Amino acid sequence: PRREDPPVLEEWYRRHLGPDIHDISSSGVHPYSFAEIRDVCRIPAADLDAVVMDDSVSQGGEGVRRAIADRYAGGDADRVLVTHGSSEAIALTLNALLHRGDRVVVQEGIYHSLGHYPRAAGCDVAVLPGRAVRDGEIDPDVLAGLVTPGTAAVIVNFPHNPTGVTLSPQGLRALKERTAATGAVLVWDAATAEIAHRWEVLADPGADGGDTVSYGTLSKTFGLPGLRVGWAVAPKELLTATFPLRDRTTLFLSPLVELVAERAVRHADELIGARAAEARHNLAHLTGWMAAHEELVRWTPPEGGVCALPVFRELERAAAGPQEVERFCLELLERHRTLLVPGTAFGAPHGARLGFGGPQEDFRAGLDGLSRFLRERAAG
Amino acid sequence: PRREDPPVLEEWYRRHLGPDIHDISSSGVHPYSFAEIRDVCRIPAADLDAVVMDDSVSQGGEGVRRAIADRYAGGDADRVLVTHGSSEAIALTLNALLHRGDRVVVQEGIYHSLGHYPRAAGCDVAVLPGRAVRDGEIDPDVLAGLVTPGTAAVIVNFPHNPTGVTLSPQGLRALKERTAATGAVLVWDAATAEIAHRWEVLADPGADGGDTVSYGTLSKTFGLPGLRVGWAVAPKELLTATFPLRDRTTLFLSPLVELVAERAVRHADELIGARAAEARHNLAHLTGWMAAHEELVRWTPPEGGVCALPVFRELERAAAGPQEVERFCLELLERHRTLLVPGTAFGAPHGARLGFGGPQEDFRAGLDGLSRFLRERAAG
Ligand SMILES: Cc1ncc(COP(=O)(O)O)c(CN[C@@H](CCCNC(N)=[NH2+])C(=O)O)c1O
Ligand SMILES: Cc1ncc(COP(=O)(O)O)c(CN[C@@H](CCCNC(N)=[NH2+])C(=O)O)c1O
């Protein structure tokens, strides 16, 4: 068999998800039960039972496309592609968009699949450093100097998994001005767009009707990672260009899943709202906890989404092999029943992803486990 | 956008599926409603409602893997990979199995995705001609002469979409003897294995616990193309080797869909049986119809599955541009409301796929439409 290393993030979860743990590691809000979905999204059993289990269509079912378009594409259902998670939307669209030798600017520490496709296509990749994004804007000098005339694409995820850094409306305006000026295609992964802490929720660039590619998903802010539904918003020409690859990989989605997805999107405010309130309660708690532990841990406060990247000063002050944070997280898990994702999953060897979108009581228990672990290490 | 021609089969359906037609074109049995699935497969609403919409796992949920393994993998759930249709199982496994320069024997006129992956990987492809398969066996001289020492893989689909040709137990034994003798990996697409007309249902090679790769799906004999669930049976080492690609494309399936899939597989005999009886009734009808139209159409009688490839003598006797059968099918559709798939989808320019797994009454109407069309063309 052809050997390739799996991404660190997904391998970590294959090995360490399990029973009797405090999972404070996710970039998403905790999942709804199907019961709760039927209640909130008003899905009578009769509506499900009526679905004929036949083929759907290559672009995604019209009903689910329309629901997504009304929210993120300015009402244009022709500019939505409905996929098996946003994972599939990324794979399909980046395969069609990116060409060998294209110059592409990619955010530092971006979700693995977004970093993979430009490499695989043989693009000339330039990295936009994380430090260049602060207070809601990309540093103007860096923006102008990295995104240059003839750049093919700029690929970003805001709010950012795992740091929670995001843009303000002004910051996004400036980014769109520069991609317009240079002819670059903005590729905008908006997985966690619906939860913003510092500024307002950012309008999807896909609503403009131009040459941008946007992603979203039900996995991170809707409580539906296990529905496996995401999307791209992009010009129809790009979306139809994905069909040859879709025809040899997934064909199309299930009409049963598409019914549930349409209803979820139509009730987005309810699904997101309940979970976002819980996430905000946990973030308040986390803010105090971080302050109380400032001698041992530092961070950038998250500005959007439901996770952050605390940095453990012990790992920096020694600056050990980058594997050290993996061993830290393994020991935290085994001794204190508490799960983070080691920063090696995100190109951040001194930090770990800490999620605050999970249930409140378990979140506090996870924080207690980590506090005890940190104290043990500081002492002795 | 990167331009590639979509496969003829999938483009044909994007353009021509619609209301008020007699669809006698499918390689599958007609779909169940979700109501019927809940009834037959004994799925109470409470069981669905209890599903937490969280992540599943890279190999496929344990319950669905076990149900599939008991049927096709000799009980070994570790040798099953559960995927989004068999389309995904093919893409994942062939990506991992096939290397540049590997010698691969591929059945003539094989489903497009199975033909694509060896080409894409840069394999040295040799074609096993359709004529070499007859009366349940590959011609011994051709088998020995094409599948040679050091051949990496032999890729076949039996029963065959679209001709319905298949092997007997003896034929499959001989094929397995030769792959064993040469060290080749048999790649066995068993999408339509459960419906056999001439010999018994063929045991899945995956049940042996050796180095073979098998595919199956709920799409063609279970009435569940819209559930989007298939599988590979293969050595676990190959299956785990697919994870890096799965991690950047689909991640995993929905636990809700996996519950339904497990129950469907456990009730396979009931789901398949009802539909197979209907298909056999239609095949009897089709056999008489073919005999009555023998001056205008010829075929190999299907030996398995639920479709056949009638050949229109008019297209052979003139041997026109291969596009002619597409125009034939377009005209049949518009004038007589009857859908076939043109043989250009299967490398068979003088024939068209005619499916007999659909509803009985519509099937007769489709045959009437085609009979009238053929008579019109013969006359004038
Ligand atoms: C930023 C971003 N973009 C896309 C995706 C893809 O998720 P889907 O929409 O396909 O669901 C993601 C997902 N990231 C998470 C993946 C977790 C996988 N689960 C398990 N069990 N391994 C994550 O970061 O954990 C993000 O983030
Ligand atoms: C032989 C074979 N192997 C795999 C597949 C893949 O189907 P899934 O398991 O992923 O469902 C197939 C499927 N073939 C059919 C595809 C029809 C697509 N539907 C539409 N609307 N385009 C087909 O031959 O029609 C086969 O056959």
CA distance readout (Å), B306 to B27, B205, B270, B275: 6, 22, 17, 10
Q: Tell me chain B's radius of gyration from C-alpha atoms.
A: 21
CB-based contacts of A188, cutoff 8 Å, min separation 6: A156, A158, A204, A205, A206, A212, A213, A214, A215
Q: How many helices (H) and strands (E) does chain A have?
A: 15, 16
Residue A292 C-alpha, separation from nearest chain B C-alpha, in angstroms: 33
Question: What are the residue ranges of helices labelled H in A203-254?
Answer: 236-241, 243-246
Structure's resolution in angstroms? 1.6
Closest alpha carbon to B318 in B272, B365, B350: B350
The total of other beta-carbon atoms located within 10 Å of residue B62's CB is: 15
Mapping DSSP to helix (H, G, I), strand (E, B) and coil, where does residue A340 land?
coil
Q: Would an 8 Å CB–CB cutoff place A44 in contact with chain B?
A: no
Give the nearest partner residue to B227 out of A113, A243, A254, using CB atoms. Answer: A254
Q: Are A192 and A218 in contact (CB under 8 A)?
A: no
Q: Are A106 and A84 in contact (CB under 8 A)?
A: no
Tokens of B23: 């669809």
Q: Are B36 and B370 in contact (CB under 8 A)?
A: no
Q: Tell me chain A's radius of gyration from C-alpha atoms.
A: 21
Q: How was this structure determined?
A: X-ray
| Residues in B touching A2 (Cβ below 8 Å) | 95-99, 241
The total of other beta-carbon atoms located within 10 Å of residue B338's CB is: 25
Verify whether the Cβ–Cβ distance B251 to A85 is below 8 Å: yes
In whole angstroms, give the CA distance from residue B165 to residue B355: 14
Residue B65 C-alpha, separation from nearest chain A C-alpha, in angstroms: 17
Residues flanking ligand 2, CB < 6 Å: A 55, 251; B 9-10, 13, 27, 85-87, 111, 157, 161, 189, 191, 217, 219, 225, 230
Portion 210-239 of B in contact with A at CB < 8 A: 223-228, 237-238
Ligand-binding annotation for B161, yes or no, is: yes
| Residues in B touching A243 (Cβ below 8 Å) | 6, 10, 14
| Residues in B touching A152 (Cβ below 8 Å) | none
User: Side chain identity at B261, as an amino acid letter?
Assistant: A
Instruction: State the fold for domain B54-269.
Output: Aspartate Aminotransferase; domain 2 (3.40.640)
Considering every ligand atom shown, identify the ligand nearest to the alpha carbon of residue A221 and give its number.
1
User: Is-cis flag, bond preceding A162, omega within 30?
Assistant: yes
In whole angstroms, give the CA distance from residue A365 to residue B312: 72
A vs B, Cβ pairs < 8 A, gives: 198
Give the nearest partner residue to B85 out of A45, A241, A251, using CB atoms. Answer: A251
- Whole-number Å distance, alpha carbon B367 to ligand 2 midpoint, is 23
Residue A244 C-alpha, separation from nearest chain B C-alpha, in angstroms: 4
Q: Which residues are bridge partners to A160 per DSSP?
A: none
Q: Are B200 and B310 in contact (CB under 8 A)?
A: no
In whole angstroms, give the CA distance from residue A99 to residue A238: 13
CA distance readout (Å), A255 to A67, A259, B158: 15, 6, 28
Mapping DSSP to helix (H, G, I), strand (E, B) and coil, where does residue A124 land?
strand
Give the nearest partner residue to A247 out of B7, B32, B55, using CB atoms. Answer: B7
In whole angstroms, give the CA distance from residue A170 to residue A174: 6
Q: Which residue has the tokens 């496309």?
A: A65
- Whole-number Å distance, alpha carbon A73 to ligand 2 midpoint, is 31
Verify whether the Cβ–Cβ distance A55 to B17 is below 8 Å: yes
Strand ranges for chain A from DSSP E: 22-23, 80-83, 103-107, 124-128, 133-134, 137-138, 153-157, 185-189, 213-217, 230-233, 297-298, 307-308, 311-312, 338-339, 341-342, 352-355
In whole angstroms, give the CA distance from residue A315 to residue A45: 53
Give the nearest partner residue to B244 out of A5, A49, A244, using CB atoms. Answer: A5
In whole angstroms, give the CA distance from residue B299 to residue B356: 14
CA distance readout (Å), B24 to B28, B329, B353: 10, 12, 8
Verify whether the Cβ–Cβ distance A55 to B13 is below 8 Å: yes
The total of other beta-carbon atoms located within 10 Å of residue A316's CB is: 13
Verify whether the Cβ–Cβ distance A256 to B34 is below 8 Å: yes
CA distance readout (Å), A46 to A43, A49, A50, B38, B51: 8, 5, 6, 12, 18
Give the nearest partner residue to B87 out of A112, A223, A251, using CB atoms. Answer: A251
Verify whether the Cβ–Cβ distance A228 to B251 is below 8 Å: yes
Q: What is the CATH number of domain A1-53+270-373?
A: 3.90.1150.10
Verify whether the Cβ–Cβ distance B247 to A6 is below 8 Å: yes
Q: Are B302 and B337 in contact (CB under 8 A)?
A: no
Verify whether the Cβ–Cβ distance A50 to B33 is below 8 Å: yes
Q: Are A185 and A150 in contact (CB under 8 A)?
A: no
In whole angstroms, give the CA distance from residue A372 to residue A137: 37
Mapping DSSP to helix (H, G, I), strand (E, B) and coil, where does residue B352 land?
strand
Q: Would an 8 Å CB–CB cutoff place B176 in contact with chain A?
A: no
Q: What is the DSSP letter of B356?
A: -
Ligand-binding annotation for B168, yes or no, is: no
DSSP strand pairing (B80-83 vs B124-128): unpaired
CATH 3.40.640.10 boundaries in chain B: 54-269
CB-based contacts of B8, cutoff 8 Å, min separation 6: B112, B342, B344, B345
Closest alpha carbon to B338 in B16, B29, B12, B8: B16
Q: How many helices (H) and strands (E) does chain B have?
A: 15, 16
What phi and psi values does residue B355 have, to the nearest 5 degrees? -95, 135
Smallest CA separation from ligand 1 atom 17, residue: A10
Which sign, positive or negative, has the C-alpha torsion A271, A272, A278, A282?
positive
| Cα dihedral A22→A24→A26→A27 (10° resolution) | 160
Closest alpha carbon to B63 in B261, B269, B268: B261
In whole angstroms, give the CA distance from residue B157 to residue B202: 12
Tokens of A376: 């043990």
In whole angstroms, give the CA distance from residue B319 to residue B330: 18
| Residues in B touching A252 (Cβ below 8 Å) | 228
Burial class (CB in 10 A: 0-12, 13-18, 19+), A114: buried
Q: Would an 8 Å CB–CB cutoff place B145 in contact with chain A?
A: no
Q: Phi-psi category of B251—alpha, beta or left, where left has phi over 0 and alpha has psi -120 to 50?
A: left
Which sign, positive or negative, has the C-alpha torsion A242, A246, A247, A249?
positive
Tokens of A263: 């209803």
Q: Are A28 and A306 in contact (CB under 8 A)?
A: yes
In whole angstroms, give the CA distance from residue B24 to residue A218: 37
CATH 3.90.1150.10 boundaries in chain B: 1-53+270-373
Closest alpha carbon to A90 in A209, A174, A12, A7: A7
From the centroid of its chain, how far is CA A148? 26
Q: What is the DSSP letter of A345?
A: G
The residues after which chain A has a C–N gap greater than 2.5 Å are none
Mapping DSSP to helix (H, G, I), strand (E, B) and coil, where does residue B95 land?
helix
User: Side chain identity at B353, as an amino acid letter?
Assistant: R
User: How many residues would you count in chain B?
Assistant: 380
In whole angstroms, give the CA distance from residue A229 to residue A257: 8
From the centroid of its chain, how far is CA A149? 28
Closest alpha carbon to A196 in A154, A137, A138, A136: A136
DSSP strand pairing (B213-217 vs B185-189): parallel
Q: Are B223 and B271 in contact (CB under 8 A)?
A: yes
Mapping DSSP to helix (H, G, I), strand (E, B) and coil, where does residue A357 land?
coil
User: Side chain identity at B352, as an amino acid letter?
Assistant: A
Q: Are A345 and A263 in contact (CB under 8 A)?
A: no
Tokens of A248: 């040899």
Q: Would an 8 Å CB–CB cutoff place A375 in contact with chain B?
A: no
User: Is-cis flag, bond preceding A159, omega within 30?
Assistant: yes
Tokens of B39: 């009834």
Q: Would an 8 Å CB–CB cutoff place B101 in contact with chain A?
A: no
With CA atoms as reference, the chain A residue closest to B7 would be A244
The total of other beta-carbon atoms located within 10 Å of residue B170's CB is: 12
In whole angstroms, give the CA distance from residue B374 to residue B298: 13
In whole angstroms, give the CA distance from residue B69 to residue B262: 11
Mapping DSSP to helix (H, G, I), strand (E, B) and coil, where does residue A36 land?
helix
DSSP structure string for A266-315:
HTHHHHHHHHHHHHHHHHHHHHHHHHHTTTTEE-PPP-BSSEE--EEHHH
Q: Which residues are bridge partners to A127 per DSSP?
A: A106
Residues annotated in a binding site of A for pyridoxal 5'-phosphate? 86-87, 111, 161, 217, 219-220, 228
Burial class (CB in 10 A: 0-12, 13-18, 19+), B149: exposed
Question: What are the residue ranges of helices labelled H in B73-225?
Answer: 85-97, 112-120, 140-146, 169-182
Tokens of B230: 């298939």
Q: Are B234 and B210 in contact (CB under 8 A)?
A: no
For chain B, the straight-line distance linking the first and the last C-alpha, in angstroms and rounded, comes to: 48
Residue A123 C-alpha, separation from nearest chain B C-alpha, in angstroms: 14
Q: Are B356 and B283 in contact (CB under 8 A)?
A: yes
Tokens of B273: 């049986």
Q: Which residues are bridge partners to A52 per DSSP?
A: B33
Closest alpha carbon to A106 in A347, A323, A300, A310: A347
Q: Would an 8 Å CB–CB cutoff place B241 in contact with chain A?
A: yes
Closest alpha carbon to A54 in A211, A258, A208: A258
Q: Are A255 and A295 in contact (CB under 8 A)?
A: no
Q: What angle do CA B302, B304, B308 make, to 5 degrees?
A: 35
Burial class (CB in 10 A: 0-12, 13-18, 19+), A145: exposed
Q: Are A284 and A67 in contact (CB under 8 A)?
A: no
CA distance readout (Å), B162 to A321, A333, B308, B343: 57, 53, 6, 9
Q: Which residues are bridge partners to A342 per DSSP?
A: A352
Smallest CA separation from ligand 2 atom 11, residue: B85
Closest alpha carbon to B214 in B248, B246, B238: B238
CB-based contacts of B141, cutoff 8 Å, min separation 6: none
Give the nearest partner residue to B6 out of A38, A117, A247, using CB atoms. Answer: A247
Ligand-binding annotation for B219, yes or no, is: yes
In whole angstroms, give the CA distance from residue A252 to residue A81: 10
